[PDB]
Amino acid sequence: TGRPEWIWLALGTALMGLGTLYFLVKGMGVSDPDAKKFYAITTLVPAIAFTMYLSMLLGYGLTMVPFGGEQNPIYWARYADWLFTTPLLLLDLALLVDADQGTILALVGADGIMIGTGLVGALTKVYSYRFVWWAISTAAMLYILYVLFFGFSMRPEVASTFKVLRNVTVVLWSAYPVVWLIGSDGAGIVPLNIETLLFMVLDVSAKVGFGLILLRSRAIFG
Amino acid sequence: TGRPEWIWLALGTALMGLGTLYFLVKGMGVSDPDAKKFYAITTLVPAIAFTMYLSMLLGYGLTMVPFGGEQNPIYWARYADWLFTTPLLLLDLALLVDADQGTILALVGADGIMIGTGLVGALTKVYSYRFVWWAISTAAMLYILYVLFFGFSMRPEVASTFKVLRNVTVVLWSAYPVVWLIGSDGAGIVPLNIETLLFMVLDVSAKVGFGLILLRSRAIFG
Amino acid sequence: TGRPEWIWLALGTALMGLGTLYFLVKGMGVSDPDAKKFYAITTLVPAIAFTMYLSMLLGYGLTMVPFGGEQNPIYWARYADWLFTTPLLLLDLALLVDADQGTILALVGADGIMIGTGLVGALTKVYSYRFVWWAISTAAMLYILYVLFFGFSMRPEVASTFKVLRNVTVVLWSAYPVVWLIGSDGAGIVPLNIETLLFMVLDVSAKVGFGLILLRSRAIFG
Ligand SMILES: *C/C=C(C)/C=C/C=C(C)/C=C/C1=C(C)CCCC1(C)C
Ligand SMILES: *C/C=C(C)/C=C/C=C(C)/C=C/C1=C(C)CCCC1(C)C
Ligand SMILES: *C/C=C(C)/C=C/C=C(C)/C=C/C1=C(C)CCCC1(C)C
């Protein structure tokens, strides 16, 4: 396309679409209920991502936001995706450790705040206000990572898998507020082409990457 | 109104509104918890449909989408409805057969993809791209119907009711991708007047029709 | 700001932000699972409200709706908030009395209808149609309050707390359809400045006020 970032949105689409097929196919073979749960969640995540990367690729989820001087291109389909897939990932972590209903509530709620404010700054028109919405969104991410460390004696083919996935999450999720800040969505110090490349490498890793590690573990069984 | 399809949107509103009253009234008389569940779900479905048919009737959920040459009228309130009521129907089927949490997750997730992509093609501006979003949406419908047949020894006043409702669903739900394709939302081979007539006959049948069959069955009790 | 209602949206933001901090901090100290549940829900409610009051304050959730003659200012961020926080409050009441899944479904569903139609009239362009959407929205509020009285033998440090919270709810929630009618969103008999003052006093009371009463009760424990 006439857009420099098409290549990464094209590669994003393929990879997400590839992970869903692999996981669905892999998904075929399960009988253990609990294990079913982890396939249902893990497969839907890139399934959703698949639909939003295509929408950006065909250009449906792209808008112009006016701010800091001129008109700015902003992929909003990114947040609609994150809106559903991140709560879906925390749910994988949550049911892995037999979380409490109460803690599952807080995580999900804080998550919706995270993305929700992230979307608000993405579409905000006053340049300065954006980073205030960024701060709050970041403040919720700190809560979530906090909770999965200090508020989150279980069987060991579980614990060890959880510590692994959680390390992945914390490192990946932490990159997103950094990319957004340096990117076109935030400081504008990095062009849209690179900002799109960064998110795609995170998304595939945090989704397909995360799912592969997960759906192989014996942790997901009885 | 100045719109040819008012009559069907007017009849849609009455019928949906009539089913909700009947089901709520009928709903009054229940004590068995589990049965309560099926009244809660079954009544809310046309309740929601009721609100969206009126919005189309008063014209709040109507927009113009430019594509394939000219400006196209598109009722988007239809998808906001389907967004909530179809997961509500699968939930009726799901709890009827004591589905697994895992399978309830997949159905609902695939459903949101179905409608979600359906909405995206409805609002897409490049004529050709629409049917690509149609294909994917259809691909999710095939998953759902699949699952309720091959991934979905239970008491017989249940099994027989389930096979019935499920037959209804498969036949009705299959009509929707056909109507959308021939209709104004898709191929434009059928005018908006007829496309509105078709969806109304499906909606009332899949909702009120489906609910009547359901809320009479002894299957919904202990 | 250049807006007369800034002061109340500024005071709304502070107070909601203050309640969340207090509840989170207070939240630190819990071990009993069930009690955790009530902190998770109760704290997220003003957390969300916090984000939407700021959005109105910075002016992100403000739009112009044309009707009854001229252009009308309409804070839509108010409904996105109510969209999530009112179901969150009913859930506090619901789990307080060990509600049935079925009844929890009806309450939440009716609630989404309430706000959902409320939003539709807020954005409707034909003056008269607004109050029709107001009527239906009100009709759902009557269902909810009904249900929490006649469809909602439990331990007494519970029952007495429930009767209390419920009295709060009914009196507060009943004020909202009145404010909306006399306000700029409805009849226009009260200016936006006063209508914004009224909602802020209700919101803080129904949220922070409601939460304080709740998170002190021994009802929330085992
Ligand atoms: C499947 C995609 C994933 C796991 C995405 C994670 C995204 C985030 C952790 C988002 C973080 C953001 C902030 C905390 C600040 C505002 C900007 C965001 C939304 C990128
Ligand atoms: C209460 C209304 C019901 C049960 C509606 C069902 C609608 C569908 C099965 C929708 C199907 C569609 C596709 C599979 C392709 C894209 C167009 C849609 C959304 C009409
Ligand atoms: C946290 C905020 C609360 C508890 C708000 C409650 C709001 C309502 C009970 C809303 C009621 C309305 C109607 C019943 C008629 C239409 C206008 C509304 C949305 C204000």
XYZ file of C-alpha atoms and ligand atoms in Angstrom:
726
model
C 0.000 0.000 0.000
C 0.845 3.704 -0.042
C 1.638 3.341 3.668
C 5.174 2.549 4.853
C 3.862 0.450 7.730
C 1.832 -1.955 5.537
C 4.625 -4.514 5.580
C 4.539 -4.841 9.360
C 0.740 -4.833 9.448
C 0.854 -7.488 6.712
C 3.331 -9.603 8.668
C 1.279 -8.989 11.827
C -1.816 -10.374 10.108
C -0.093 -13.489 8.776
C 1.592 -14.403 12.054
C -1.519 -13.888 14.175
C -3.577 -15.838 11.676
C -0.938 -18.541 11.744
C -0.949 -18.833 15.512
C -4.726 -19.163 15.634
C -4.715 -22.000 13.105
C -1.913 -23.756 14.958
C -3.631 -23.368 18.322
C -7.051 -24.426 16.969
C -5.582 -27.462 15.279
C -3.529 -28.124 18.412
C -6.717 -27.408 20.358
C -8.109 -30.426 18.572
C -6.851 -33.239 20.787
C -8.064 -32.065 24.204
C -10.429 -33.831 26.584
C -9.500 -32.510 30.034
C -11.978 -29.717 30.830
C -9.534 -27.382 32.583
C -7.143 -27.818 29.670
C -9.992 -26.909 27.337
C -10.294 -23.594 29.193
C -6.675 -22.697 28.429
C -7.114 -23.530 24.718
C -10.326 -21.530 24.444
C -8.671 -18.445 25.900
C -5.264 -18.818 24.293
C -6.636 -19.341 20.798
C -9.167 -16.519 20.841
C -6.455 -14.012 21.738
C -4.579 -14.051 18.422
C -7.914 -14.736 16.741
C -9.022 -11.268 17.789
C -5.611 -9.751 17.081
C -5.870 -11.311 13.641
C -9.048 -9.385 12.923
C -7.664 -6.062 14.126
C -4.314 -6.286 12.312
C -6.214 -6.869 9.060
C -8.483 -3.916 9.778
C -5.421 -1.725 10.136
C -3.922 -3.355 7.063
C -6.968 -2.660 4.860
C -7.040 0.655 6.737
C -10.412 0.481 8.494
C -9.054 1.177 11.952
C -6.966 4.222 11.067
C -7.932 7.774 11.949
C -6.536 11.294 11.897
C -6.162 13.037 15.244
C -5.355 16.749 15.164
C -2.824 17.837 17.777
C 0.434 19.585 18.602
C 0.276 21.418 15.281
C -0.897 19.148 12.473
C -2.997 16.099 11.633
C -1.769 12.841 13.160
C -2.441 9.295 11.929
C -3.689 7.070 14.718
C -4.507 3.357 14.528
C -7.409 2.988 16.965
C -8.094 -0.636 16.025
C -5.047 -1.393 18.193
C -6.980 -0.557 21.394
C -10.145 -2.409 20.459
C -7.890 -5.480 20.191
C -6.013 -4.870 23.444
C -9.434 -4.210 24.981
C -10.297 -7.867 24.673
C -7.015 -9.733 24.363
C -5.128 -8.448 27.436
C -7.902 -9.402 29.884
C -7.805 -12.746 28.083
C -4.102 -13.167 28.859
C -4.388 -12.239 32.567
C -7.163 -14.815 32.721
C -4.677 -17.437 31.511
C -2.323 -16.411 34.338
C -5.218 -16.145 36.777
C -6.668 -19.606 36.196
C -3.141 -21.038 36.062
C -2.723 -20.137 39.728
C -6.341 -20.693 40.760
C -6.758 -16.972 41.434
C -9.523 -15.617 43.646
C -12.666 -14.226 42.026
C -11.834 -11.009 43.888
C -8.345 -10.767 42.434
C -9.587 -11.736 39.002
C -11.947 -8.766 39.253
C -9.242 -6.246 40.158
C -6.863 -7.360 37.405
C -9.508 -7.176 34.678
C -10.893 -3.878 35.992
C -7.451 -2.305 36.222
C -6.759 -3.622 32.717
C -9.824 -1.984 31.198
C -8.705 1.197 32.851
C -5.222 0.773 31.342
C -6.356 0.362 27.751
C -9.343 2.653 28.209
C -7.184 5.575 29.266
C -4.606 4.572 26.677
C -7.271 4.966 24.040
C -8.326 8.322 25.477
C -4.843 9.776 25.214
C -4.502 8.321 21.717
C -7.488 10.386 20.599
C -6.905 13.459 22.784
C -6.487 16.742 20.872
C -4.390 18.737 23.359
C -0.823 17.383 23.041
C 0.058 17.832 26.738
C -3.118 16.110 28.000
C -2.096 12.911 26.202
C 0.797 12.204 28.589
C -1.458 12.765 31.575
C -3.679 10.010 30.182
C -0.461 8.073 29.569
C 0.580 8.422 33.212
C -2.697 7.074 34.580
C -2.706 4.212 32.085
C 0.827 3.438 33.168
C -0.270 3.669 36.806
C -2.755 0.860 36.165
C -0.122 -1.348 34.501
C 1.969 -1.082 37.654
C -0.998 -2.293 39.684
C -1.458 -5.365 37.461
C 2.218 -6.363 37.447
C 2.263 -5.647 41.172
C -0.717 -7.916 41.760
C 0.749 -10.778 39.741
C 3.826 -10.734 41.992
C 2.670 -9.958 45.527
C -1.033 -10.887 45.505
C -0.844 -13.755 43.020
C 2.121 -23.603 47.712
C 0.805 -24.839 44.341
C 1.900 -27.880 42.288
C 5.336 -27.321 40.744
C 4.593 -28.016 37.056
C 2.410 -24.930 37.516
C 4.406 -22.561 39.707
C 7.419 -22.846 37.413
C 5.270 -22.294 34.330
C 3.617 -19.342 36.015
C 6.905 -17.686 36.928
C 7.904 -18.075 33.278
C 4.762 -16.634 31.668
C 4.722 -13.861 34.239
C 8.327 -12.934 33.426
C 7.325 -12.716 29.767
C 4.335 -10.521 30.560
C 6.149 -8.035 32.793
C 8.970 -7.559 30.257
C 6.659 -7.328 27.260
C 3.893 -5.267 28.834
C 6.492 -2.779 30.146
C 7.686 -2.102 26.622
C 4.289 -0.840 25.434
C 4.173 2.362 27.490
C 7.707 2.991 26.280
C 6.908 2.488 22.599
C 3.782 4.612 22.874
C 5.740 7.438 24.444
C 8.518 7.503 21.868
C 6.124 6.716 19.014
C 3.746 8.772 16.836
C 0.937 8.152 19.338
C 2.995 10.026 21.945
C 6.224 12.001 21.709
C 6.576 11.665 17.940
C 10.301 10.981 18.305
C 9.880 7.702 16.400
C 8.007 7.641 13.084
C 4.838 5.628 12.554
C 6.764 3.018 10.549
C 8.992 2.089 13.467
C 6.236 2.419 16.065
C 4.176 -0.056 14.051
C 7.174 -2.425 13.891
C 7.682 -2.325 17.625
C 4.058 -3.099 18.534
C 3.942 -5.929 16.042
C 7.013 -7.618 17.581
C 5.494 -7.205 21.044
C 1.990 -8.364 20.063
C 3.127 -11.554 18.317
C 5.491 -12.298 21.181
C 3.005 -11.576 23.962
C 0.294 -13.508 22.152
C 1.638 -16.267 19.919
C 4.908 -16.397 21.863
C 3.035 -16.494 25.188
C 0.567 -19.081 23.885
C 3.201 -21.505 22.635
C 4.956 -21.594 26.006
C 1.584 -22.104 27.666
C -0.131 -24.724 25.519
C 2.831 -27.089 25.820
C 3.105 -27.028 29.611
C 1.705 -29.916 31.621
C 0.567 -27.149 33.960
C -2.652 -26.787 31.951
C -3.863 -30.306 32.850
C -5.114 -32.276 35.823
C -42.195 7.501 7.754
C -40.523 8.567 4.513
C -38.715 5.213 4.598
C -40.164 2.155 2.844
C -38.840 -0.162 5.542
C -40.631 1.593 8.446
C -43.462 -0.922 8.355
C -41.149 -3.853 9.028
C -39.191 -1.929 11.655
C -42.548 -0.986 13.203
C -43.724 -4.599 13.204
C -40.294 -5.659 14.499
C -40.659 -3.297 17.456
C -44.169 -4.438 18.362
C -43.403 -8.153 18.183
C -40.176 -7.917 20.177
C -41.890 -5.735 22.743
C -44.712 -8.245 22.863
C -42.424 -11.193 23.459
C -40.648 -9.441 26.316
C -43.922 -8.672 28.086
C -45.122 -12.235 27.595
C -41.856 -13.715 28.842
C -41.633 -11.328 31.825
C -45.205 -12.034 32.816
C -44.573 -15.732 32.187
C -41.305 -15.244 34.072
C -43.500 -14.374 37.015
C -44.299 -17.822 38.384
C -40.800 -19.292 38.724
C -39.083 -20.552 41.862
C -36.547 -23.110 40.621
C -33.193 -21.298 40.413
C -31.936 -22.967 37.229
C -35.273 -22.198 35.596
C -34.846 -18.588 36.678
C -31.591 -18.506 34.700
C -33.380 -19.466 31.481
C -36.051 -16.774 32.007
C -33.480 -14.090 32.765
C -31.592 -14.822 29.559
C -34.552 -15.543 27.312
C -36.438 -12.402 28.282
C -33.530 -9.985 28.013
C -32.866 -11.079 24.435
C -35.981 -9.579 22.834
C -35.800 -6.841 25.458
C -32.580 -5.669 23.845
C -33.875 -6.315 20.332
C -36.875 -4.210 21.282
C -34.651 -1.240 22.024
C -32.657 -1.545 18.810
C -35.637 -2.020 16.474
C -37.137 1.191 17.876
C -33.846 3.014 17.400
C -33.887 2.015 13.753
C -37.567 2.896 13.576
C -37.079 6.426 14.960
C -33.924 6.372 12.824
C -31.198 6.743 15.454
C -29.230 3.706 14.366
C -29.104 4.494 10.654
C -26.013 5.751 8.865
C -24.728 6.463 5.376
C -21.741 4.441 4.206
C -20.069 5.560 0.981
C -19.012 2.701 -1.283
C -19.101 1.071 -4.701
C -20.131 4.386 -6.240
C -22.671 6.210 -4.086
C -23.914 6.726 -0.537
C -25.402 3.634 1.102
C -27.897 3.499 3.982
C -26.735 1.165 6.719
C -28.577 0.256 9.924
C -25.755 -0.208 12.437
C -28.100 -0.587 15.411
C -28.645 -4.116 14.067
C -25.120 -5.182 15.126
C -25.208 -3.560 18.544
C -28.268 -5.763 19.159
C -26.741 -8.951 17.754
C -23.656 -8.056 19.797
C -25.519 -8.831 22.982
C -28.429 -11.058 22.021
C -26.637 -13.848 20.107
C -24.207 -14.620 22.952
C -27.341 -14.648 25.099
C -28.927 -17.338 22.921
C -25.842 -19.611 22.827
C -25.832 -19.301 26.603
C -29.362 -20.737 26.644
C -28.112 -23.688 24.568
C -24.928 -23.904 26.621
C -26.564 -24.088 30.043
C -29.233 -26.404 28.620
C -26.542 -29.024 28.055
C -24.383 -28.130 31.056
C -21.605 -26.936 28.746
C -18.011 -26.615 29.908
C -16.698 -23.195 30.919
C -14.060 -23.751 28.227
C -16.609 -24.385 25.498
C -18.775 -21.536 26.704
C -15.732 -19.306 26.233
C -15.051 -20.399 22.650
C -18.667 -20.015 21.529
C -19.014 -16.503 22.949
C -15.579 -15.453 21.675
C -16.247 -16.800 18.195
C -19.626 -15.048 18.308
C -18.144 -11.647 19.098
C -15.806 -12.209 16.214
C -18.769 -13.064 13.960
C -20.773 -9.930 14.676
C -17.672 -7.798 15.144
C -16.389 -8.560 11.666
C -19.933 -8.358 10.344
C -20.092 -4.821 11.638
C -16.709 -4.013 10.106
C -17.785 -5.058 6.634
C -21.063 -3.182 7.089
C -19.116 0.046 7.558
C -16.226 -0.680 5.175
C -15.798 1.850 2.342
C -14.085 -0.325 -0.284
C -16.848 -2.492 -1.810
C -14.628 -5.559 -2.368
C -13.208 -5.533 1.186
C -16.719 -5.990 2.590
C -17.017 -9.583 1.339
C -13.628 -10.428 2.795
C -15.004 -9.315 6.161
C -18.118 -11.310 5.265
C -16.070 -14.459 4.663
C -14.316 -14.312 8.029
C -17.573 -13.569 9.834
C -19.076 -16.543 8.058
C -16.031 -18.616 9.015
C -16.815 -17.953 12.679
C -20.477 -18.957 12.276
C -19.319 -22.321 10.958
C -17.211 -22.780 14.078
C -20.187 -22.089 16.373
C -22.603 -24.400 14.548
C -19.793 -26.944 14.379
C -19.223 -26.732 18.121
C -22.907 -27.119 18.955
C -22.954 -30.407 17.025
C -19.635 -32.155 17.624
C -18.332 -30.571 20.844
C -21.685 -29.943 22.517
C -25.756 -38.954 27.996
C -27.998 -36.220 29.450
C -31.621 -36.458 30.666
C -34.020 -36.870 27.737
C -36.445 -33.981 28.377
C -33.289 -31.955 27.721
C -31.504 -33.705 24.865
C -34.664 -33.667 22.759
C -35.278 -30.000 23.536
C -31.666 -29.228 22.734
C -31.767 -30.976 19.369
C -34.861 -28.905 18.590
C -33.513 -25.473 19.566
C -30.233 -26.284 17.865
C -32.031 -27.188 14.630
C -33.784 -23.821 14.799
C -30.519 -21.978 15.371
C -28.549 -23.619 12.562
C -31.334 -22.995 10.018
C -31.996 -19.436 11.147
C -28.411 -18.353 11.739
C -27.431 -19.709 8.294
C -29.930 -17.410 6.630
C -28.283 -14.234 7.953
C -25.055 -14.445 5.946
C -27.246 -15.132 2.933
C -29.528 -12.142 3.475
C -26.572 -9.867 4.140
C -24.910 -10.947 0.922
C -27.935 -10.436 -1.302
C -29.045 -7.347 0.628
C -28.096 -3.642 0.578
C -25.422 -4.304 3.213
C -23.681 -6.597 0.713
C -24.316 -7.322 -2.955
C -27.134 -4.802 -3.338
C -29.149 -7.298 -5.383
C -32.055 -6.951 -2.935
C -33.311 -3.496 -1.932
C -33.226 -2.242 1.645
C -36.986 -2.780 1.983
C -36.733 -6.514 1.403
C -33.479 -6.897 3.332
C -35.178 -5.289 6.324
C -38.136 -7.682 5.934
C -35.905 -10.720 5.888
C -33.947 -9.817 9.036
C -37.130 -9.007 10.892
C -38.631 -12.447 10.136
C -35.385 -14.096 11.238
C -34.937 -11.985 14.389
C -38.466 -12.537 15.712
C -38.211 -16.228 14.902
C -34.748 -16.734 16.381
C -35.678 -14.722 19.455
C -39.381 -14.844 20.278
C -39.824 -18.071 18.309
C -36.784 -19.633 20.006
C -37.879 -18.392 23.432
C -41.396 -19.796 23.224
C -40.132 -23.288 22.415
C -37.661 -22.977 25.276
C -39.701 -21.507 28.121
C -42.338 -24.227 27.799
C -39.977 -27.201 27.948
C -39.625 -29.134 31.185
C -35.951 -29.197 30.225
C -35.442 -25.855 31.986
C -36.269 -27.301 35.433
C -34.840 -29.671 38.007
C -11.788 26.731 32.300
C -14.119 28.722 30.056
C -16.887 26.375 31.218
C -19.056 27.235 34.233
C -19.290 23.586 35.250
C -15.503 23.036 35.522
C -15.588 23.583 39.269
C -17.985 20.697 39.839
C -16.153 18.461 37.373
C -12.931 19.428 39.171
C -14.412 18.602 42.571
C -15.890 15.410 41.092
C -12.433 14.315 39.950
C -10.744 15.015 43.282
C -13.370 13.267 45.396
C -13.551 10.172 43.199
C -9.777 10.005 43.079
C -9.728 10.391 46.837
C -12.172 7.569 47.429
C -10.197 5.187 45.235
C -6.971 5.873 47.124
C -8.732 5.451 50.454
C -10.399 2.212 49.384
C -7.205 0.800 47.821
C -5.182 1.642 50.893
C -8.024 0.310 53.042
C -8.151 -2.624 50.625
C -4.643 -3.346 51.814
C -5.329 -5.333 54.973
C -7.698 -8.007 53.644
C -7.237 -11.771 53.676
C -10.774 -13.183 53.633
C -11.547 -14.058 49.998
C -15.200 -12.983 50.005
C -14.155 -9.701 51.594
C -11.597 -9.300 48.822
C -14.461 -9.480 46.316
C -16.211 -6.503 47.917
C -12.993 -4.428 47.885
C -12.247 -5.274 44.264
C -15.693 -4.139 43.162
C -16.089 -1.186 45.496
C -12.717 0.323 44.646
C -12.959 -0.032 40.880
C -16.244 1.878 40.845
C -14.870 5.312 41.760
C -11.687 4.333 39.939
C -13.672 4.330 36.713
C -15.679 7.396 37.716
C -12.358 9.089 38.376
C -11.284 8.551 34.788
C -14.544 9.807 33.306
C -14.847 12.936 35.469
C -11.347 13.945 34.346
C -12.256 13.308 30.719
C -15.179 15.679 31.096
C -12.951 18.088 32.989
C -10.273 18.198 30.263
C -13.268 18.135 27.908
C -12.707 14.875 26.025
C -16.137 13.454 26.731
C -18.162 16.498 25.706
C -20.147 16.729 22.492
C -22.650 18.969 20.743
C -26.060 17.481 20.010
C -28.350 19.481 17.730
C -31.988 19.493 18.820
C -35.099 21.464 19.704
C -33.686 24.484 17.887
C -29.973 24.918 18.551
C -26.750 23.101 19.398
C -26.712 21.412 22.804
C -23.671 20.495 24.914
C -23.809 16.895 26.059
C -21.327 15.083 28.304
C -21.368 11.528 26.940
C -18.481 10.364 29.130
C -21.103 10.255 31.900
C -22.786 7.188 30.335
C -19.591 5.307 29.578
C -18.924 5.566 33.331
C -22.427 4.554 34.419
C -22.126 1.758 31.852
C -19.569 0.025 34.015
C -20.017 1.384 37.523
C -23.753 0.775 38.091
C -23.559 -2.947 37.252
C -20.615 -2.935 39.652
C -22.779 -1.538 42.455
C -25.683 -3.987 41.944
C -23.056 -6.713 42.095
C -22.089 -5.469 45.564
C -25.753 -5.736 46.607
C -26.132 -9.035 44.769
C -23.196 -10.829 46.375
C -24.115 -9.284 49.733
C -27.326 -11.311 49.695
C -25.941 -14.344 47.866
C -28.146 -13.582 44.860
C -29.002 -16.210 42.265
C -27.042 -16.295 39.011
C -30.427 -15.870 37.316
C -31.291 -12.734 39.256
C -27.794 -11.373 38.832
C -28.343 -11.721 35.086
C -31.637 -9.814 35.038
C -30.341 -6.924 37.147
C -27.233 -6.413 35.014
C -29.175 -6.832 31.762
C -31.875 -4.399 32.838
C -29.111 -2.017 33.928
C -27.389 -2.032 30.548
C -30.754 -1.306 29.046
C -31.229 1.601 31.478
C -27.968 3.359 30.689
C -27.991 2.234 27.068
C -31.329 3.879 26.377
C -30.303 6.809 28.547
C -27.357 7.328 26.253
C -29.579 7.033 23.185
C -31.897 9.795 24.327
C -28.891 11.916 25.293
C -27.709 11.830 21.684
C -31.117 11.824 19.968
C -31.723 14.742 17.575
C -35.532 14.957 17.686
C -36.384 16.687 20.992
C -39.612 14.724 21.599
C -37.997 11.314 20.958
C -35.592 11.911 23.851
C -38.315 11.577 26.505
C -39.545 8.371 24.917
C -36.032 6.998 25.408
C -36.202 8.508 28.897
C -39.419 6.634 29.677
C -38.023 3.240 28.700
C -34.798 3.880 30.599
C -36.905 4.820 33.588
C -38.990 1.679 33.066
C -35.837 -0.406 33.501
C -34.846 1.413 36.709
C -38.208 0.459 38.186
C -37.495 -3.177 37.373
C -34.122 -3.073 39.164
C -35.426 -1.356 42.304
C -38.395 -3.713 42.168
C -36.126 -6.745 41.999
C -33.966 -5.600 44.905
C -37.080 -5.433 47.098
C -39.350 -8.317 46.118
C -36.999 -10.793 44.408
C -33.878 -10.048 46.442
C -33.444 -15.637 56.258
C -29.813 -14.469 55.995
C -27.351 -13.584 58.790
C -28.293 -10.287 60.447
C -25.012 -8.348 60.116
C -25.853 -8.697 56.419
C -29.603 -8.179 56.153
C -29.374 -4.924 58.096
C -26.461 -3.726 55.972
C -28.344 -4.703 52.844
C -31.482 -2.813 53.827
C -29.257 0.218 54.402
C -27.330 0.146 51.112
C -30.538 -0.613 49.256
C -32.261 2.404 50.820
C -29.348 4.537 49.635
C -29.551 3.132 46.118
C -33.300 3.563 45.650
C -33.206 7.185 46.871
C -30.103 8.100 44.892
C -30.888 6.209 41.701
C -34.394 7.750 41.649
C -32.910 11.229 41.560
C -31.054 10.637 38.281
C -34.091 10.375 36.001
C -35.349 13.516 37.703
C -32.145 15.494 37.192
C -31.886 14.354 33.588
C -35.426 15.477 32.890
C -35.069 18.939 34.388
C -31.490 19.298 33.137
C -29.875 20.316 29.824
C -29.876 16.668 28.717
C -33.684 16.727 28.905
C -36.167 19.532 29.493
C -33.565 22.299 29.596
C -35.318 23.899 32.569
C -32.077 23.714 34.574
C -28.819 24.993 33.067
C -25.818 22.755 32.471
C -24.029 24.253 35.486
C -26.670 23.069 37.928
C -27.261 19.761 36.150
C -23.547 19.037 36.472
C -23.694 19.925 40.189
C -26.578 17.581 40.820
C -24.991 14.546 39.138
C -21.732 15.136 40.943
C -23.445 15.119 44.367
C -25.293 11.934 43.417
C -22.260 10.167 41.913
C -19.953 10.797 44.879
C -22.721 9.803 47.264
C -23.779 6.675 45.384
C -20.164 5.648 44.895
C -17.849 6.918 47.622
C -20.756 7.346 50.041
C -22.066 3.853 49.231
C -18.581 2.342 49.444
C -17.765 3.779 52.856
C -20.922 2.335 54.404
C -20.117 -0.989 52.762
C -16.408 -1.478 53.404
C -16.858 -0.941 57.141
C -19.644 -3.474 57.656
C -18.822 -6.867 59.123
C -21.317 -8.091 56.535
C -18.512 -8.352 53.967
C -16.686 -11.092 55.921
C -17.084 -14.723 56.891
C -1.915 -8.499 23.109
C -1.282 -7.134 23.340
C -0.744 -6.757 24.565
C -0.338 -7.829 25.576
C -0.602 -5.410 24.810
C -0.203 -4.789 25.983
C -0.331 -3.401 25.994
C -0.085 -2.590 27.087
C 0.591 -3.145 28.340
C -0.467 -1.259 27.024
C 0.110 -0.218 27.702
C -0.089 1.141 27.519
C 0.163 1.948 28.641
C 0.360 1.266 29.996
C 0.254 3.485 28.595
C -0.700 3.974 27.499
C -0.348 3.290 26.189
C -0.545 1.770 26.202
C -2.031 1.444 25.971
C 0.280 1.231 25.013
C -31.083 -12.290 17.489
C -30.467 -12.251 16.098
C -29.724 -13.305 15.578
C -29.883 -14.706 16.168
C -28.865 -13.027 14.541
C -27.945 -13.872 13.938
C -27.079 -13.259 13.034
C -26.027 -13.888 12.393
C -25.868 -15.406 12.450
C -25.114 -13.110 11.697
C -24.366 -13.508 10.621
C -23.607 -12.723 9.767
C -22.541 -13.378 9.128
C -22.149 -14.774 9.616
C -21.736 -12.780 7.960
C -21.692 -11.260 8.158
C -23.111 -10.730 8.273
C -23.875 -11.243 9.499
C -23.470 -10.421 10.735
C -25.369 -10.993 9.196
C -22.343 5.694 39.783
C -23.533 6.435 39.189
C -24.845 6.018 39.378
C -25.185 5.098 40.551
C -25.789 6.460 38.481
C -27.124 6.096 38.391
C -27.794 6.568 37.263
C -29.096 6.250 36.922
C -30.008 5.518 37.906
C -29.559 6.606 35.665
C -30.859 6.867 35.325
C -31.344 7.426 34.153
C -32.667 7.088 33.822
C -33.345 5.959 34.600
C -33.485 7.786 32.719
C -32.508 8.219 31.620
C -31.421 9.086 32.232
C -30.537 8.359 33.251
C -29.465 7.543 32.507
C -29.845 9.468 34.073
